């Protein structure tokens, strides 16, 4: 078992972060209001097709049409496995389909073999070849009772208004970092697998809003490192320094050490750091600090390693200033690719925070 497959949500109960979009489908199934076609939008990665399945699962089930599909019946097992007679799946991105959309949409008006509905899950509907496309519109304005359409697309804009108006389309949003972090944790706790705090952070942030990938990365961390989701392993796949460099840089910067700031930048450079990644860490550090200055409990989980240093800055540097550094660096990140070289970009910035330093570098003849 790999935690990518083993955690495919089986009920809306265990889906993560799409709150409304499920409140509308759970209510839809509960009361009995199921429309001719559902259009799911959102970027690749988000539960589009996953939540699509769970819909058909709540429709075909032997315990009735409920938002709570039994996970054991003969229908559910076959739905989740991805091998159901009535849940026909068509991927519009593939060039080698057996009987292309036109032939699978030919049988539309025919009865459902096992179940109340003959559901059609089409992924990337905007990629469909034209002659089959209109075939849907013959059915959409006058579709049989036994048929249902589950549509998915990375881009709605490439779907003609003829279809976007006949469907009840739902937009699935990305997930915040912490939202993914929190789920990963929960899975690793219940699964009894060794994990660290900074790891789950690095893992979540790496998966950009997709729990799907989040887990697939978590699985390669388990294979690459020890059977332990450790910071060492995680930053081994991704490529984070795994060093206190971002912090010491901040510490130097704020004392107006230049010599050491430029020094650190150099050593840093020698280990092939991703300059933007470095700036991001610094911004994140500058942020927690300001949080600590507001409510002293803000220093988190694996950040216990810094605690002392972090807090020392909190009590010694003016918040007014802490904002100033943050700002100056943020800006730096925007102009970063404007710079002739990414490193000189980083030097441009940090030297900048050193000068526009209260009680720092001054001019002369």
């Amino acid at each position: 078992q790999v935690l990518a497959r083993k955690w495919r949500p089986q009920t809306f109960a265990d889906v993560v972060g799409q709150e409304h979009v499920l409140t509308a489908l759970a209510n839809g199934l509960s009361l009995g209001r199921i429309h001719h076609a559902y259009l799911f939008s959102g970027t690749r990665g988000v539960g589009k097709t996953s939540i699509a399945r769970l819909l058909a699962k709540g429709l075909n089930c032997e315990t009735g049409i409920t938002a709570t599909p039994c996970g054991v019946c003969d229908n559910c097992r076959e739905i989740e496995q991805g091998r159901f007679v009535d849940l026909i799946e068509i991927d519009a991105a593939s060039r080698t389909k057996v009987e292309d959309t036109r032939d699978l949409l030919d049988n539309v008006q025919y009865a459902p073999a096992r179940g109340r509905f003959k559901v059609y899950l089409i992924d990337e509907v905007h990629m469909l070849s034209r002659h089959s496309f209109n075939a849907l519109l013959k059915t959409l304005e006058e579709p049989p009772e036994h048929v249902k359409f589950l549509l998915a697309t990375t881009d709605p804009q490439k779907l003609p208004v003829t279809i976007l108006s006949r469907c009840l389309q739902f937009h699935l949003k990305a997930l915040d970092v912490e939202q993914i972090r929190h789920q990963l944790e929960h899975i690793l706790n219940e699964e009894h697998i060794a994990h660290e705090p900074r790891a789950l952070q690095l893992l979540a942030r790496a998966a950009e809003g997709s729990l799907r990938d989040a887990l697939s990365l978590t699985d390669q961390a388990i294979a690459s490192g020890d059977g332990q989701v450790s910071t060492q392993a995680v930053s081994a796949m991704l490529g984070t320094l795994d060093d206190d460099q971002a912090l010491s840089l901040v510490e130097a910067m704020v004392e107006a050490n230049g010599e050491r700031v430029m020094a650190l930048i150099n050593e840093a450079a020698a280990r092939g750091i991703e300059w933007e990644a470095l700036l991001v860490e610094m911004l994140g550090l500058l942020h927690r600090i300001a949080m600590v200055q507001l409510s002293p409990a803000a220093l988190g989980n694996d950040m216990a390693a810094i605690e002392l240093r972090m807090r020392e800055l909190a009590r010694t540097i003016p918040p007014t200033d802490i904002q100033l550094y943050y700002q100056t660096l943020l800006i730096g990140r925007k102009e970063l690719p404007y710079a002739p070289d990414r490193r000189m970009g980083v030097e441009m910035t940090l030297l900048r925070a050193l000068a526009f330093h209260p009680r720092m570098p001054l001019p002369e003849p």
Binding site: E208, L238, D341, L351, P361
Partner: protein, 334 residues
Amino acid sequence: MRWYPWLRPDFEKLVASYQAGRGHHALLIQALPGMGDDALIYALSRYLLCQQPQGHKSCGHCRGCQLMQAGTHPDYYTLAPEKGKNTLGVDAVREVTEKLNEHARLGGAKVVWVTDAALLTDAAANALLKTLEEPPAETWFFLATREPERLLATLRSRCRLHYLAPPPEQYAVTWLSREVTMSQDALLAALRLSAGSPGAALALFQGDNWQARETLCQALAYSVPSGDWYSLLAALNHEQAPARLHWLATLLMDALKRHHGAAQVTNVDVPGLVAELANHLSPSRLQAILGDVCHIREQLMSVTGINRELLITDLLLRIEHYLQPGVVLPVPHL
């Protein structure tokens, strides 16, 4: 495509794993331009594509070695981007995927190489992944990229990232003294003006570039003490304007660093310059100029066709107003 000396220590452990089994079926090498990124991939594949290897290298005779010296081979697959376009296709990938799905023609190992993975289509990335998940027994892969972050996190997780680090400066300079006779002081400057890449350093000299660069420092040395920055116009106004503006920037940086007492300097070539510069220009004045030079260099590179002449004349004259007492220099935006 020339085997450099620093490529050895890395090449050692990379075969040391292909001999003891620890070899990773997917390898992503990150390295600066002209760091011999080229030669390391090729040198590694010749070791795995040998029918009768002699220990650390090949024999030269065997079918592999021969068809290898002949380039054309049934197990070597070069995945260069589509000729004409600056990206790679989802097609090329699929056709090499299934190409490996069948037994190796010479009965042994099969190898794949990418020019730069950061140049492929997003769909091309995914299309490649599934194969690394379903690894055809005893096959080998070699990714390569200057920037591994601009690569899909799910993809760079499947491969083993290996940092091809620039060799120690003392070694890079000696190697360089051979390829071109120039003062070591110059040699080091080139090296530093290449992030340590000895290959790029070397190429810095091969045009008349260096001479073009010497013209710049002479002009600068006149202007710095005189104030007449508009004299650089002749030195900068040229199609090579951006490469030149960058040069002028490194000198600006250095002077800035010296104000903070930073030991390291890129332009070791002319310490007398960075000195005077830093002397006549406050760390603020320098900041100001550094930027305009910076943003102006970019409009030249990016915007389709502005007046190289006007823009620069404007940069120049503008630099001189920052130098005048009482003027309130600029601050970055957003």
